[PDB]
Amino acid sequence: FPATV
Amino acid sequence: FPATV
Amino acid sequence: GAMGSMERASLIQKAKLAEQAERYEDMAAFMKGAVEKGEELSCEERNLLSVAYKNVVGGQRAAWRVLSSIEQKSNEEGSEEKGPEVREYREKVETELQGVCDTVLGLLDSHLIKEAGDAESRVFYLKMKGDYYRYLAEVATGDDKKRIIDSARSAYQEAMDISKKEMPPTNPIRLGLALNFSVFHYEIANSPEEAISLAKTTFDEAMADLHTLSEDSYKDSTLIMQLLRDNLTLWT
Amino acid sequence: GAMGSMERASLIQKAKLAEQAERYEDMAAFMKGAVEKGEELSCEERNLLSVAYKNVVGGQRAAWRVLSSIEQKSNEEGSEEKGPEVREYREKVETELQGVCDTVLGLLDSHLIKEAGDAESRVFYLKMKGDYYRYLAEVATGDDKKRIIDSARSAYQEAMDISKKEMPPTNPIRLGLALNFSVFHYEIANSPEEAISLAKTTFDEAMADLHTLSEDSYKDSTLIMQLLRDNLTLWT
Ligand SMILES: CC(C)(Oc1ccc(Br)cc1)C(=O)Nc1cccc(-c2csc(C(=N)N)c2)c1
Numbered sequence A, B: 001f002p003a004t005v
Numbered sequence C, D: 001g002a003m004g005s006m007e008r009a010s011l012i013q014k015a016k017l018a019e020q021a022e023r024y025e026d027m028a029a030f031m032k033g034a035v036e037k038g039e040e041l042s043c044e045e046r047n048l049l050s051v052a053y054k055n056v057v058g059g060q061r062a063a064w065r066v067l068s069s070i071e072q073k074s075n076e077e078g079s080e081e082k083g084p085e086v087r088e089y090r091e092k093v094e095t096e097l098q099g100v101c102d103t104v105l106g107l108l109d110s111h112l113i114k115e116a117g118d119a120e121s122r123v124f125y126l127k128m129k130g131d132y133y134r135y136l137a138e139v140a141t142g143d144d145k146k147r148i149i150d151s152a153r154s155a156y157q158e159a160m161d162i163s164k165k166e167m168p169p170t171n172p173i174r175l176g177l178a179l180n181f182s183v184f185h186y187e188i189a190n191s192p193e194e195a196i197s198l199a200k201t202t203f204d205e206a207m208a209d210l211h212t213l214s215e216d217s218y219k220d221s222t223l224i225m226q227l228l229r230d231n232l233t234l235w236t
């Protein structure tokens, strides 16, 4: 999955 | 800590 | 509220203890109680709230994905049948996840967003609103799916508009908002080109503003810039 | 029981799904429901029950230790005061841990142990009884602490007596029982010499019986033997 914060 | 199972 | 009898300061203290103990469900419950005292949240308190719920919902999302994968395979050709149990349990986890998202969205709507006037608070909360609608969209399949997606988009867009007017391009909240809105475009809105454009423009505008920063601010901004680059590498 | 309306087989299936999703609280609730159907548990089902509760209580124990450490430091010289919150939250986690242990002990007493006649089931359940009393002893401080310790000892001793009469020295249940009873001696009963003697004798008697085993049984037995050696290395 892509990075989120 | 020591190992337990 | 089961936290109604506990002092605000004690709830914040116990949220920090719960974090140290990796008890994120408790952390979130303490922070919900703190929000429900009705006072605005400081910067530290806003981040305690977000850390707690991000960890709770992140675990639910991971579990939902495992179960959805199992369910998908069960419904392929070759599998004969194993009953309603996989769907039922995926639905149970899904309903619990939706409940947590609804709880967070409820705190934002009653009344964190409407009292948030400074950019650092208002952008932070609107980003959260977009994030929790995005998590609802990840599991949505019904008559309301398009409206859930549009609710996420609208919250992210309001946050973006404020962030571009009121924050420097290296502000970590502005960067994290762009990171997540870019992921929304890629994974939710079927808009990979918008996701890539947003990540690239955000990264480049931040790069150009790093020269204004102290060493500590530089560290914070470059950390999020590296996440933007990581996603760009994944997508190109 | 909130699981009273769900089929036994569906509860077992969902316990396995919960494990795949790393949802151990759900796993334990499904297995509790399965036990409460009143039928004996198969070997696989006994291990699902133990895996679920071991993971739940293991997380509680880790959190309790973090909080107890913070509480200890707060009560040293130099610390001025930070209020009742650390003690209160440590107590909250402690009470939840005690509740889980009491639940497991209740399942063993109503009625898993009394219906368990084969060594593989009876030793397994008595080991669990010793383990959950040991977890109660780790947090005990009151009039009943010595009785809690003796309840753990008594359960482990009955399991040990059966295991030595009815199982080969390489049986993994017998090995795991000895491993944990040895830890009980070291950490709970202030008996490090008994802990070391038990671990060494168990290891050596298992070594001498490995020649009778298939490759797969050898793998299972040597895995637990290595834990015995790891503890001996820690303690000597
Ligand atoms: C993940 C990381 C590195 O960056 C971002 C960046 C943008 C957004 Br939007 C969100 C996170 C972060 O957490 N930054 C951060 C920024 C300001 C305060 C705190 C904080 C105070 S207390 C506390 C706690 N965990 N007890 C954490 C943490």
Ligand SMILES: CC(C)(Oc1ccc(Br)cc1)C(=O)Nc1cccc(-c2csc(C(=N)N)c2)c1
Residues within 6 Å of the ligand: B005, D019, D043, D044, D047, D048, D051, D124, D127, D172, D173, D175, D176, D177, D223, D224
């Ligand atoms: C930790 C390890 C390696 O060894 C021991 C040894 C002694 C004791 Br007493 C306890 C554990 C173990 O788990 N062994 C084992 C033995 C027999 C069955 C299963 C099982 C069936 S299903 C399932 C699941 N997790 N879905 C697990 C697992």
Ligand SMILES: [Mg+2]
Residues within 6 Å of the ligand: C007, C008
């Ligand atoms: Mg007050």
Ligand SMILES: [Mg+2]
Residues within 6 Å of the ligand: C091, C094, C095
């Ligand atoms: Mg649903």
Ligand SMILES: [Mg+2]
Residues within 6 Å of the ligand: none
């Ligand atoms: Mg643009």
Ligand SMILES: [Mg+2]
Residues within 6 Å of the ligand: D007, D008
């Ligand atoms: Mg039936």
Ligand SMILES: [Mg+2]
Residues within 6 Å of the ligand: D091, D094, D095
């Ligand atoms: Mg107590």
Ligand SMILES: [Mg+2]
Residues within 6 Å of the ligand: none
């Ligand atoms: Mg002896």
